[PDB]
Design a protein around this ligand. Structure first.
Ligand SMILES: *C(N)[C@@H]1CC[C@H](C#C)N1C(=O)CNC1(C)CCN(c2cc(C(=O)O)ccn2)CC1
Lengths: 726, 726
């Protein structure tokens, strides 16, 4: 009939998804920014007004890529001169616009090249980092107060994370946390003094005669890690002639005994803060609860009021220990932890009591706690229909755990099976975001009766466009591997005929706690391969997968590169045994961890796969960062796990590549997974006489996301797959 | 018929060429090494004896990769622990062996990591460089005399060249010159203090956790160059307590006025040395002839003995001003210079007279002066049959320039048209080396009558093998473009049929003063392409080509990337008009300058070529080194030749690559043509949306010559060509 979803539709993004990104400014109003003007909406009735006109800054003389209204409704922080750094960090220029007098504050403005900026939770206080030092501005137009003086590029970081903490433990650039009402400002300091540096070339624009060398503090497995220190300062007792005084919170002793990390800071009350520490051997973590001492000024963390979280089967937390949610009086909290059965559920704690109480249970897991009222506890879980790849919002009554209600399950079971949620300040209202299996659906509700107020966006426009295109379908099912069931998904070509034999591409990631089989609606490269090239694209969640309990997830503990690749191979082998797969044309590909798995599978000598594509893969764990690698592999020492670090490299399987067609791709400026990793893969293949294909992307990083490089890499990969299958 | 010359034959070197490398130790004898022992031959009769048995060093305990017998016959220098650096430079360990007492010297031995070592020209003195300083040994077993104390890594070089001087001017690591009888030791000192560094990553073995950054002083076009100083020391006037005094030889003023180079040093007599200096604008060069002053100890270079060499059409010399050949008394000399008609011929000079007298003339060129007696001057030229691609030995009478005799022309006109020669100490005997077009043939002759004494090697063995294989044929001919004729060669498939239409591969280099069409016999990749794949491999010498006079060579002055690439297109366009060429399958490939040209040709938008391969190409001249680049391009300033520098880049033609299949290959540790150059090419292609093939070779340099890499790249390229043509 009509056309198919082509490679150009994907690259040029002709079929666009509509979103509904709102920013709650209260328990009743949210701002719905548009391509032009920002509106303010009344959640209850839906009426709206204009918060500030698009023309308001026609003559700002700079392109504004982001705004950040103070919790005051009094000021607007304007971000411009954006310059991306790593995955989360970046620098920019900031201007404060006074909403009152509609004037642009021109005095004592924030420095250019500022690293981080954030308002206080309540007032209009400002805290920012610049040149690695922390500054506080009690008033938009008032002079700033330097809180720290030790900041030093690539060495001492105050209020901001270094490379590894940004990527692997905080997933943020910021390392500062205001107290509930803004009185205190807590921050972290990182010392990269002896951390080795990764060095690589950056060629820049053509006009650069000499390539520059980029050097950054990056600790590879087994190397010297950065050290951290926590501090708290009172933003009210700050003079303007005396240097602010920061109180350091240290220990615990079970942590200070060796290398450790700071993996979480959460304020309980206005004078109570919780901190979670993790040993370098991420087997054991400790939460300290510290209270402010009025007539002392310092903070005390009572031993006995601390809680230990450890595992004997694997590491702690999914990626790190979960975050606690404190009750009004801060004398108790709720947090996700692994069951005695290995399933993650909500445990209820009394700050001075060792044993907690699980308020949920079952062979499913709580993905996260979304909101806590004195009445109910709202959380997301994959309980419904026993599908680990589904996400639903549930509320449990704190007075009767026996009373848990599903708020998303039945809204539209056919179209919606994967939800995310966004509550207002007091959780009076909430916005549900459905992202599959049907077209993304955004709606608004009220917590009191859980009444559906209205549809914010149903993507009806895209719906109309897609009915004139031959789209692929998605199969989400499971297979059985010795007692246990493992899920998978397959993007099936239009007019799928189970009688016919199709070529198959295994799309892989498979890193610990990952999930490639779900109910999410996507418009990606796989859509095109299936719609236009009639290729089945499958993904399988084997041992190591998350959201299914620890027996499965911790199965690859200390053994990266074993079961998770073997299982990907076993899936393929079983997919071909379903009858609609041409086992002479089965390929595999992945990015980053997926690149590692792809390479390991292709070098396994299974002969199952004809060809494969590895994009920015890890080739050996000693090349990757410590925080992530060590979490699963332990330490690369003969006393610990060295032997396996050495047995799970790609280069040792070089000889086996003689049987396959391989495409190795990598960005030269990858700061995460260093080009080095592929450099060594290609070298081992050359030393063994194996022919293969390669492609480097100069000055591109781990995402290979610039507009041009992105279109080029997927175009190159399409050709490779088409050639391998035709 | 039987079999063909396969890719494996080329890669595994199954069909070995034999050589007869001899070393003249006197005017009557020479040394001829064997895989085992070294023999000594009597040129007159041919009888030989063993100089030193192979077993001699059975239990040396070290793999010796090179020997060096003193011009004494008394000692043998043993080279081991060899470690390569750039094209000519390398470090190693050295042990001396006393052939007199057949003892291994163990006292005061040469240090490890020695950068260079050389015997004096007559006795058994030794001069070596270590840690950038010069040392002298009057006796193999005696304490060494330090000569210099300024040596500093990557900064000050004594006795050895820096990167650019090694590659572009001296084509050697060595920068020290012994006087004829060994009395004086002259050397050059290089200062790279402000020379920018090229930096690139070296991955090393898999075990290396953090990649290393290599940094070498390398001046790119227009950058700050290294400065040079010259000194001469009397190695007979050394105490053992006094830090020997080096006498500096400075200027000339016409040189000191700005940036310049030392491009040649030649000793005239025991007390007369000659130096040649060149302006950074390699248009003007001054030669100084200096004399040792007995009651001064210093050296004086009399203006009046200095000769100037300059050019108005281009640069001076083929790659540098030619070297002088002095008559016994050092009162006059001969050297190859450009004619008034633009052809290089031998000119005769009186050391104190400005004007010289050409002793040869014609529309052909003297390639080199090989020997000089009181009676004759022997030289190589391409006069015979008027074909620029042939080489023959000639001897001219000093009494009558009218009497020039060809000593190789007729020895075997069918088999031999390309000669080189090696004279004995007093030119009483000489060995001729025919390297094509037939199999290489080595013979001996006596100068008195020019009588052939005997055949040294005729490669009869290799001849027997090759008869049982279908070898390709070689056609050397020319075409005519506007009055002028340009030569070309084609490797033709076995049983070539001018009626049939064959696919054509244009093997290109085309650098200024290059020659790809000659009568040399070669067993290489092209041999495989033609023999086994039936592909015609052609090469064309257009504008910029050498050995045909300046009109042709200087055509591209200040204009690289113009006529030389255009002509290569014209040649293909001309070949495809001979009838035995499938104009639908014309490919092109090259290395270094050939890579550059191939890239410019593929980006020309000519429509003539279907695909191409560029290996380690130059992409824009500002990225290449100053000495070579500025020699033809001048300086990259708006006051000089900047506009053309910006007009001859490969990336400006990115768009046009849409019409061809391109393969970009580059070693990552290329210290000569930096990976950066291919990195900017790939970026321009990505940014323009052009698809292509690439392949990097980790830790490989300009030659990509490691055993495995070499086999790998030719295998990869073969697949590419085969695919493009089948
Ligand atoms: C590739 N994925 C590399 C090598 C293998 C290892 C894994 C898995 N890699 C990492 O980069 C590890 N770091 C994390 C776990 C990658 C996934 N991740 C993440 C975060 C966001 C976000 O918005 O915060 C988005 C996508 N992926 C967290 C870091």
């Amino acid at each position: 009939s009509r056309k198919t979803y082509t490679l150009t539709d994907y690259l040029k993004n002709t079929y666009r998804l509509k979103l509904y990104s709102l920013r709650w400014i209260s328990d009743h109003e949210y701002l719905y920014k548009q391509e032009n003007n920002i509106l303010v909406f009344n959640a209850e009735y839906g009426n709206s007004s204009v918060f500030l006109e698009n023309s308001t800054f026609d003559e700002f003389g700079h392109s504004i890529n982001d705004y950040s209204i103070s919790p005051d409704g009094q000021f607007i922080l304007l971000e411009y001169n954006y310059v991306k750094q790593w995955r989360h960090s970046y620098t920019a220029s900031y201007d404060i616009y006074d909403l009152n007098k509609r004037q642009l504050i021109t005095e004592e403005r924030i420095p250019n090249n500022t690293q981080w900026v954030t308002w206080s939770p309540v007032g209009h206080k400002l805290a920012y980092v610049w040149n690695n030092d922390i500054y506080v501005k009690i008033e938009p137009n008032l002079p700033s107060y330097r809180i720290t003086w030790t900041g030093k590029e690539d060495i001492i970081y105050n209020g901001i994370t270094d490379w590894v903490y940004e990527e692997e433990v905080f997933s943020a650039y910021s390392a500062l946390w205001w107290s509930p009402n803004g009185t205190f400002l807590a921050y972290a300091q990182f010392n990269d003094t002896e951390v080795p540096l990764i060095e690589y070339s950056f060629y820049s624009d053509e006009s650069l005669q000499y390539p520059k060398t980029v050097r950054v503090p990056y600790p590879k497995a087994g190397a010297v890690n950065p050290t951290v220190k926590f501090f708290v300062v009172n933003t009210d007792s700050l003079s303007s002639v005396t240097n602010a005084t920061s109180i350091q919170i240290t220990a615990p002793a079970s942590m200070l005994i060796g290398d450790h990390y700071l993996c979480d800071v959460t304020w309980a009350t206005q004078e109570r803060i919780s901190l979670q520490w993790l040993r370098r051997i991420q087997n054991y973590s400790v939460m300290d609860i510290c209270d402010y001492d009025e007539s002392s000024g310092r903070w005390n963390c009572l031993v006995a009021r601390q809680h230990i979280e450890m595992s004997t089967t694997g590491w702690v937390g999914r990626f790190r220990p979960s975050e606690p949610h404190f009750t009004l009086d801060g004398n108790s909290f709720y947090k996700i932890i692994s069951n005695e059965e290995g399933y993650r559920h909500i445990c209820y704690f009394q700050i001075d009591k060792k044993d907690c109480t699980f308020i949920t249970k079952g062979t499913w897991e709580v993905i996260g706690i979304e909101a806590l009222t004195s009445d109910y506890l709202y959380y997301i879980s994959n309980e419904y229909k026993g599908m680990p790849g589904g996400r639903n919002l549930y509320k449990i009554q704190l007075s009767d755990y026996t009373k848990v209600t599903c708020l998303s399950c039945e809204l539209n079971p056919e179209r919606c099976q994967y939800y995310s949620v966004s509550f207002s300040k007091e959780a009076k209202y909430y916005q549900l975001r459905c992202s599959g299996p049907g077209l993304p659906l955004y709606t608004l509700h009220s917590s009191v009766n859980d009444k559906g107020l209205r549809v914010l966006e149903d993507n009806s426009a895209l719906d109309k466009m897609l009915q004139n295109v031959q789209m692929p379908s998605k199969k989400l099912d499971f297979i059985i591997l010795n007692e246990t069931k493992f899920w998978y998904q397959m993007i099936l070509p239009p007019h799928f005929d189970k009688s016919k034999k199709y070529p198959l591409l295994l799309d892989v990631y498979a890193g610990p706690c990952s999930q490639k089989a779900d109910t999410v609606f996507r418009l990606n490269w796989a859509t095109y391969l299936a719609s236009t090239e009639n290729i089945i694209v499958a993904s399988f969640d084997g041992r190591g997968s998350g959201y299914q309990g620890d027996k499965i997830m911790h199965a690859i503990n200390r053994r990266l590169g074993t079961f998770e690749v073997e299982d990907q191979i076993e899936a393929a082998r079983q997919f071909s045994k379903m009858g609609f797969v041409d086992n002479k044309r089965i390929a595999i590909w992945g990015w980053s961890y997926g690149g590692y798995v792809t390479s390991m599978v292709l070098g396994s000598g299974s002969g199952v796969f004809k060809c494969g594509i590895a994009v920015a893969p890890v080739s050996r764990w000693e090349y990757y960062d410590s925080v992530y690698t060590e979490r699963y592999m332990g330490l690369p020492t003969p006393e610990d796990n060295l032997d396996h670090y050495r047995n799970s490299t790609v280069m040792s399987r070089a000889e086996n590549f003689k049987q396959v067609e391989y495409l190795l791709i990598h960005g030269t400026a990858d700061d995460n997974v260093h080009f080095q990793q592929s450099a060594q893969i290609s070298k081992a293949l050359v030393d063994v006489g194996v022919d293969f294909q390669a492609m480097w992307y100069t000055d591109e990083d781990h995402g290979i996301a610039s507009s041009t490089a992105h279109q080029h890499i997927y175009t190159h990969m399409s050709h490779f797959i088409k050639q391998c299958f035709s």
